[PDB]
Design an enzyme around this catalytic site. Structure first.
Site, PDB file in Angstrom:
ATOM      1  N   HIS A 195      -1.314   4.683  13.160  1.00 17.04           N
ATOM      2  CA  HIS A 195      -1.956   3.387  13.030  1.00 17.04           C
ATOM      3  C   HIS A 195      -1.074   2.244  13.516  1.00 17.04           C
ATOM      4  CE1 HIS A 195      -0.234   1.338   9.541  1.00 17.04           C
ATOM      5  NE2 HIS A 195      -0.013   2.509   8.975  1.00 17.04           N
ATOM      6  N   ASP A 197       0.836  -1.180   0.000  1.00 20.64           N
ATOM      7  CA  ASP A 197       0.000   0.000   0.000  1.00 20.64           C
ATOM      8  C   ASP A 197       0.881   1.244   0.000  1.00 20.64           C
ATOM      9  OD1 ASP A 197      -2.145  -1.752  -0.222  1.00 20.64           O
ATOM     10  OD2 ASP A 197      -2.921  -1.364   1.799  1.00 20.64           O
ATOM     11  N   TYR A 253       0.529 -13.040  11.086  1.00 21.59           N
ATOM     12  CA  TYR A 253       1.539 -13.389  10.106  1.00 21.59           C
ATOM     13  C   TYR A 253       2.688 -12.406  10.278  1.00 21.59           C
ATOM     14  CZ  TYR A 253       1.168  -9.933   6.233  1.00 21.59           C
ATOM     15  OH  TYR A 253       1.258  -8.808   5.473  1.00 21.59           O
TER      16      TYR A 253
HETATM   17  C1  LIG Z   1       0.892   2.716   7.822  1.00 22.43           C
HETATM   18  C2  LIG Z   1       0.642   1.619   6.813  1.00 22.43           C
HETATM   19  C3  LIG Z   1       1.610   0.653   6.599  1.00 22.43           C
HETATM   20  C4  LIG Z   1       1.415  -0.401   5.685  1.00 22.43           C
HETATM   21  C5  LIG Z   1       0.197  -0.451   4.964  1.00 22.43           C
HETATM   22  C6  LIG Z   1      -0.782   0.542   5.175  1.00 22.43           C
HETATM   23  C7  LIG Z   1      -0.600   1.552   6.091  1.00 22.43           C
HETATM   24  C8  LIG Z   1      -1.686   2.585   6.282  1.00 22.43           C
HETATM   25  N1  LIG Z   1      -0.079  -1.432   4.048  1.00 22.43           N
HETATM   26  C9  LIG Z   1       0.812  -2.370   3.861  1.00 22.43           C
HETATM   27  C10 LIG Z   1       0.477  -3.388   2.922  1.00 22.43           C
HETATM   28  O1  LIG Z   1      -0.563  -3.440   2.291  1.00 22.43           O
HETATM   29  N2  LIG Z   1       1.445  -4.350   2.787  1.00 22.43           N
HETATM   30  C11 LIG Z   1       2.654  -4.398   3.474  1.00 22.43           C
HETATM   31  O2  LIG Z   1       3.414  -5.340   3.239  1.00 22.43           O
HETATM   32  N3  LIG Z   1       2.973  -3.398   4.355  1.00 22.43           N
HETATM   33  C12 LIG Z   1       2.089  -2.435   4.545  1.00 22.43           C
HETATM   34  N4  LIG Z   1       2.370  -1.398   5.447  1.00 22.43           N
HETATM   35  C13 LIG Z   1       3.656  -1.393   6.192  1.00 22.43           C
HETATM   36  C14 LIG Z   1       4.904  -0.699   5.591  1.00 22.43           C
HETATM   37  O3  LIG Z   1       4.778   0.685   5.176  1.00 22.43           O
HETATM   38  C15 LIG Z   1       5.492  -1.627   4.504  1.00 22.43           C
HETATM   39  O4  LIG Z   1       5.580  -2.972   4.984  1.00 22.43           O
HETATM   40  C16 LIG Z   1       6.911  -1.341   4.008  1.00 22.43           C
HETATM   41  O5  LIG Z   1       7.193  -2.020   2.778  1.00 22.43           O
HETATM   42  C17 LIG Z   1       7.910  -1.773   5.072  1.00 22.43           C
HETATM   43  O6  LIG Z   1       8.767  -0.655   5.398  1.00 22.43           O
HETATM   44  P1  LIG Z   1      10.291  -0.641   4.914  1.00 22.43           P
HETATM   45  O7  LIG Z   1      10.257  -1.266   3.564  1.00 22.43           O
HETATM   46  O8  LIG Z   1      10.733   0.771   5.067  1.00 22.43           O
HETATM   47  O9  LIG Z   1      11.068  -1.582   5.999  1.00 22.43           O
HETATM   48  P2  LIG Z   1      12.393  -1.575   6.944  1.00 22.43           P
HETATM   49  O10 LIG Z   1      12.271  -0.813   8.210  1.00 22.43           O
HETATM   50  O11 LIG Z   1      13.621  -1.190   6.207  1.00 22.43           O
HETATM   51  O12 LIG Z   1      12.374  -3.153   7.196  1.00 22.43           O
HETATM   52  C18 LIG Z   1      11.482  -3.692   8.209  1.00 22.43           C
HETATM   53  C19 LIG Z   1      12.196  -4.785   8.977  1.00 22.43           C
HETATM   54  O13 LIG Z   1      12.810  -5.735   8.068  1.00 22.43           O
HETATM   55  C20 LIG Z   1      14.087  -6.142   8.565  1.00 22.43           C
HETATM   56  N5  LIG Z   1      15.137  -5.649   7.669  1.00 22.43           N
HETATM   57  C21 LIG Z   1      15.083  -4.553   6.840  1.00 22.43           C
HETATM   58  N6  LIG Z   1      16.187  -4.328   6.168  1.00 22.43           N
HETATM   59  C22 LIG Z   1      17.032  -5.342   6.590  1.00 22.43           C
HETATM   60  C23 LIG Z   1      18.357  -5.653   6.238  1.00 22.43           C
HETATM   61  N7  LIG Z   1      19.071  -4.931   5.371  1.00 22.43           N
HETATM   62  N8  LIG Z   1      18.910  -6.751   6.819  1.00 22.43           N
HETATM   63  C24 LIG Z   1      18.184  -7.443   7.708  1.00 22.43           C
HETATM   64  N9  LIG Z   1      16.934  -7.241   8.114  1.00 22.43           N
HETATM   65  C25 LIG Z   1      16.402  -6.163   7.513  1.00 22.43           C
HETATM   66  C26 LIG Z   1      14.236  -5.551   9.974  1.00 22.43           C
HETATM   67  O14 LIG Z   1      13.841  -6.463  10.983  1.00 22.43           O
HETATM   68  C27 LIG Z   1      13.333  -4.308   9.892  1.00 22.43           C
HETATM   69  O15 LIG Z   1      12.816  -3.866  11.145  1.00 22.43           O
END
Ligand SMILES: *Cc1cc2c(cc1C)nc1c(=O)[nH]c(=O)nc-1n2C[C@H](O)[C@H](O)[C@H](O)COP(=O)(O)OP(=O)(O)OC[C@H]1O[C@@H](n2cnc3c(N)ncnc32)[C@H](O)[C@@H]1O
Ligand SMILES: *Cc1cc2c(cc1C)nc1c(=O)[nH]c(=O)nc-1n2C[C@H](O)[C@H](O)[C@H](O)COP(=O)(O)OP(=O)(O)OC[C@H]1O[C@@H](n2cnc3c(N)ncnc32)[C@H](O)[C@@H]1O
Lengths: 523, 523
Positions: free
Chosen positions: B389, B150, B470
């Protein structure tokens, strides 16, 4: 010469054997020469007696498997878990490490625990064969179909956990694996996915569960003994059509591959796994080798042409299957004819149009591509006397030039060892397999040593050209894992750290996939 | 109040900080109050200040990531790896454990390393957002499409590694993940799959490689820091059609689910992920809450009816998309109309037929279901002031009665906490998600504590009915992992054994997914 587990006295083993009999029952613990003969690799490789089991134990329950494992821990007995132990082409039932106790889970743990028509899955025990399951599906007049490998006598679980493949659209078995129960190396028992949540109905509905997704780590693995495993089952389509495409020239490979890829990559119009097999593969299916040439050593070109003309087949022969309502089948068959039609000398035949002796394979692939277990590929062992086989399957990008290079590479080294190029190319989605099968006299110690050397060479050579095996024989596990040595063998060091964490006594299948626990390393 | 890593003196941290600056450069190491404010969970949960970073380090290369990790090992500094750190709904960029150094890989490691039209994949660094990638695809006029969540501002890698989902046929991101490079917890670097074989072109073509298949273990994981990751990209279809189906009765859920399943399970005619969202979800998209009711606390039925009538929408609203040549689209749209048509009061609308204010969502799902990143769902935060949220998404079998039970269960407990039931049901293949979103005043400490309690209750309750999440927020990781306690918490004990084997100094993201290394256990 009583076979004993590494560093275990005659006495301690007699105790352990007793404790094993206490768990499963005297009947189901074997430990004599005559009894243990049955579990020899039926297609031995090497001249030498390698792999030799100290006992076989057939448990009936998860709980027994746990007890065995705890006992094996105490005594430091290595365990070799098998489902059916028909891993033929890859080492049968023989343990990588001599003196190991074979745990035959599939002897008694062979129940079809559940088949669910609504959601389209099954939950199985290791002993369920592809025949066992297909029977169930026919008996109960299911709307589901299974996806089988070439040889149906094997375990569904066993196959899945070696990341085996089949040829229906559900051909990536591991992909459809959902949920398993496993006994970890110190005897603990665990469920993955939604199985880990008590009460959940989704164990076979959602693979991933929560937190790190571990199932993959139990494939090509020595990290436990699987006692239950789920698999999704596709719904039987309304109708299906198999077909052959014969290509005359050995050089047609290049354009065949380059045309197959774009027809497959969107799972249409090639909806099954496209498989292309050479002429020698079709000869072995029907005839003996003496029929076409009676010299020891490679076949001359005249023989090859006689094989083509007699069976009425190209050097390469392509087999596909289409599924759906007859409109869609016709629509797709057309697209496929127009596509491959652009190659000089490309004839097309359905499963109706060929009942001759060259269309034997087409009849067989029609069965396999439709979830009907056969043992048809055993006929390929009559090519030579005492025939057995070893598999070698490098993986590469699906590119014609790359395919042609593999063809030349392998056939070349194959002829140097006086063996026939029984080979195929198949394509998953975006990946290419070079499915080579080598058939050999199993009763001739020279022949066995030759085959072993040959594959070891094919492996070394392939790896130097950037081609790794997706799966290998017991005998080349160490060799193959050595090819995946990027970052100075980073991958194996990782495997080892995990192996040592879950299996501190070094009990389970030491050496599997080249992964040895601490107490066996330095050898 | 200078934030310090557990058990590290002001002095040692100043040294380490220096060594960190030596690796990445003074500019890219932050360690002051003002600088560190930016990395606060932007949607805090709880009244209390929880999660507080001791520094942020932005490396530019794998090699730097290795150096950081080695330094963190020496000093026992906990590291919190992030890609973009926009994990909004699940805790943003804030570390499960206070005093942790955040490693922002995506700040500088943001290259699109490769996009390959022929084989249909990309190889990406953590900093590549869905916008960044979509731009590349448009710039270079690709024939490929991405699959976006999203919110498009997030990392493709980050999302994939939380097993995030999207709504095109490539909606199971992890499924299409092929190959990754990761720095393990002691600084070693490793490649999975065919990446582990030097020279192989198949790193993004074949996921499994050889031996145990480990990639899954780096999802929802604290077992390393991913520096590169491949993903397959589907080919853009010839054409597409999105559509809405409004259902009047709240009780229509039962028959909607039971009809959706058999249309989805064979990936046709429902070729995208079927998503069904309630009315409150559509209101928040366009309007503020005060527009429909100005009381604090639950909405009366008259409001709900006004929302339905004004926006011209059912209580449940279904959104699908079809892909292919226009014949196939029509053929499938028909099958879908005939199928859902059997429910009293079921109106159908395409993306052409609605430009009114209720069809806003339909316009948005048409974008998302076609691989067009938006930030449209941020508009849902204007429902209330200072809106933020938290996500809660239990998993279950796709059965109407089961859905109805979840609806009642959640809405009930939601109203007790004076919050609105912004919920949906979606279906993967054989699995059901209860996608609940709860919007709340982020500036009100009471509201935050209330939300935290509420979800903790929803989690406990769901788990008692056999429903596991999940994926979850930072704040409920411990709670959720406690629900997956079959075999007396067998799963977590396994995770712990592995965590301790790869991460003996307990460096990486302690607590992630409820998995704590030895030195943090007993707390
Ligand atoms: C507010 C919101 C969020 C949202 C959504 C709707 C709303 C209103 N709808 C979503 C949807 O339909 N589907 C979905 O999968 N997510 C949805 N979200 C949540 C969010 O915005 C998204 O998931 C987004 O793609 C995730 O954020 P981002 O991509 O910025 O993630 P990150 O902080 O970097 O990673 C999250 C966790 O993953 C592990 N991680 C990340 N990078 C690494 C690396 N390099 N190495 C190891 N692990 C890693 C970490 O645990 C991290 O916390
Ligand atoms: C000779 C031959 C073989 C063959 C083939 C054609 C010929 C001529 N074509 C195949 C094909 O197209 N596709 C395929 O996947 N395999 C093909 N084969 C090989 C073989 O017959 C099949 O793979 C068969 O399905 C495997 O045999 P089986 O199913 O009997 O396997 P197993 O010995 O029990 O398992 C093999 C290994 O898996 C691990 N394993 C098994 N059970 C467990 C349990 N319970 N727990 C943990 N690990 C387990 C072991 O490592 C074992 O060695």
């Amino acid at each position: 010469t009583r076979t004993l587990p590494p560093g275990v006295s005659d006495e301690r083993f007699d105790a352990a054997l007793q404790r094993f009999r206490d768990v499963v029952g005297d009947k189901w613990v074997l430990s004599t020469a005559d009894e243990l003969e049955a579990f020899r690799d039926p297609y031995p490789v090497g001249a030498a007696e390698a792999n030799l089991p100290s006992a076989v134990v057939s448990p009936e329950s998860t709980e027994q498997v746990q007890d065995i494992v705890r006992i094996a821990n105490e005594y430091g007995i290595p365990l070799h878990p098998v489902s059916t132990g028909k891993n033929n082409g890859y080492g049968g039932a023989a343990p990588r490490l001599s003196g190991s106790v074979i745990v035959k889970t599939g002897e008694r743990m062979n129940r079809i625990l559940e088949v669910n028509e609504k959601y389209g899955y099954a939950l199985l025990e290791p002993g369920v064969t592809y025949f066992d399951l297909y029977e169930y599906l026919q008996s109960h007049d299911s709307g589901l179909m299974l996806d089988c490998p070439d040889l149906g006598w094997g375990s569904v679980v066993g196959n899945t956990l070696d990341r085996g493949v089949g040829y229906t659209p559900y051909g990536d078995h591991f992909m459809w694996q959902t949920g398993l129960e496993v006994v970890l190396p110190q005897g603990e028992v665990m469920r993955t996915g939604m199985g880990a949540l008590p009460g959940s109905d989704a164990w076979q509905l959602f693979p991933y569960g929560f937190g790190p997704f571990p199932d993959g780590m139990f494939t090509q693995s020595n990290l436990g003994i699987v006692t239950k495993m789920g698999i999704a089952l596709m719904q039987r389509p309304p109708a299906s059509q198999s077909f052959l495409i014969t290509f005359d020239k050995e050089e047609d490979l290049e354009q065949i591959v380059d045309i197959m890829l774009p027809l497959r990559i969107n799972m249409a119009p090639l909806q099954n796994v496209p498989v292309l097999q050479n002429i020698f593969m079709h000869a072995a299916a029907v005839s003996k080798r003496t029929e076409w040439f009676d010299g020891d050593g490679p076949m001359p070109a005249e023989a090859i042409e006689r094989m083509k003309k007699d069976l009425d087949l190209g050097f390469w022969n392509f087999y596909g299957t289409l599924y759906g309502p007859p409109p869609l089948i016709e629509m797709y068959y057309g697209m496929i004819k127009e596509a491959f039609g652009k190659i000089p000398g490309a004839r097309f035949f359905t499963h109706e149009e060929r009942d001759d002796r060259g269309g034997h394979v087409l009849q067989d692939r029609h069965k396999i591509n439709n979830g009907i277990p056969s043992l048809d590929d055993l006929q390929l062992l009559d090519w030579v006397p005492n025939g057995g086989h070893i598999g070698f399957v490098p993986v590469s990008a699906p590119d014609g030039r790359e395919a042609m290079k593999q063809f030349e590479m392998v056939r070349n080294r194959a002829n140097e060892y006086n063996k026939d190029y029984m080979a195929g190319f198949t394509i998953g989605l975006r990946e290419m397999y070079h499915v080579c099968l080598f058939i050999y006299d199993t009763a001739d110690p020279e022949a066995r040593e030759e085959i072993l050397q040959m594959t070891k060479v094919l492996v070394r050579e392939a790896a130097e050209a950037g081609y790794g095996e997706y799966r290998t024989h017991n005998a080349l596990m160490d060799d193959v894992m050595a090819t995946f040595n990027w970052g100075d063998g980073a991958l194996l060091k990782f495997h080892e750290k995990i192996k040592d964490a879950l299996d501190p006594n070094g009990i389970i299948a030491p050496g599997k996939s080249g992964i040895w626990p601490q107490r066996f390393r330095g050898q």
